Amino acid sequence: KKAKLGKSDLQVFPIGLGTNAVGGHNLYPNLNEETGKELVREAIRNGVTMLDTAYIYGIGRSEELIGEVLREFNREDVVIATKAAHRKQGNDFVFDNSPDFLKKSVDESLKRLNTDYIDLFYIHFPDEHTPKDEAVNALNEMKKAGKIRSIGVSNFSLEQLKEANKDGLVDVLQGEYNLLNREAEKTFFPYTKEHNISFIPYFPLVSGLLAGKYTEDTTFPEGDLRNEQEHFKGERFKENIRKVNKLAPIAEKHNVDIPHIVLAWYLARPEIDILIPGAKRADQLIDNIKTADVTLSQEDISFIDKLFAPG
Ligand SMILES: NC(=O)c1ccc[n+]([C@@H]2O[C@H](COP(=O)([O-])OP(=O)(O)OC[C@H]3O[C@@H](n4cnc5c(N)ncnc54)[C@H](OP(=O)(O)O)[C@@H]3O)[C@@H](O)[C@H]2O)c1
Ligand code: NA
Structure with missing residues (x-):
């Protein structure tokens, strides 16, 4: 129903x-914005609380569309979480975590979202030169001013996280994690x-x-970055496909699909x-939300854990 996000007051x-x-648009071709707006709208309608966006998502357009749909509902009923770090350069970006850039990022995010505050603001990626506790302190200024209600970091190393949370101002960490890459459990979970x-x-x-x-017979076109991901190369692809299918019974058991179980x-x-x-x-x-209705048994959880053991 409602989960509290770490040290924050976010439910x-x-x-x-x-x-x-x-x-x-910079990420997907032929996006229909009205479809996007309708999806956001549907989400809020169906009980979704948190909308996760970022500056890189359409160079602000994602925040803009979300901002338009937001006028339709009550602001206090939605948790907006956005991020910044990508600094435009030469048709490519460089990460910037400097105080001036982060504060500017917040103010520009608020304008694009057309709202008085942002619930959760992230440092999307770490830059290589800014002391991370200073970057966070910069966001902390916007927090004290009431412009953001919580701060988070993303794609930080354990070391950079420690530094950023030097004063315990980091409430959320967003990182890459799945059944094929469970490193976070050893590197981040203990600390978080x-x-x-x-x-x-x-x-x-x-x-x-x-x-x-x-399926094991699936193939991708030349140039497709997927048949170059690693978990898709050689026997790894077939191996993982054949390994994911071993979750079919559990899915059947709970009347959902493998993705829901995962x-x-x-x-x-x-x-x-x-x-x-x-x-x-x-x-x-509406299909993603069904995941919330699932309740795996300790028996199911253990099997999956062992089935997808790292080594
Ligand atoms: N740095 C950050 O903080 C951050 C945050 C979020 C995302 N990202 C990046 O954005 C990209 C997308 O992230 P993501 O979390 O959305 O990755 P993801 O886990 O790869 O997206 C889910 C993938 O599974 C498929 N899928 C979803 N539901 C499915 C279902 N019910 N049945 C069958 N297939 C289903 C989707 O296919 P279709 O699209 O074909 O439906 C899609 O390819 C990644 O490359 C990631 O690195 C970065
Ligand atoms: Na949990």
């Missing part, structure tokens, strides 16, 4: 929405759990690989309070 439905496909930092994973389905989207597993981790599955259309959102 959210365990299934949030990823908005990279809402006006994220300790310091009551909520952990939000991304890339939980590994491009559909862990969602039953393919995600429910992540949610079952004491260290994770919410997921941010993506979507292009409203209907897809």
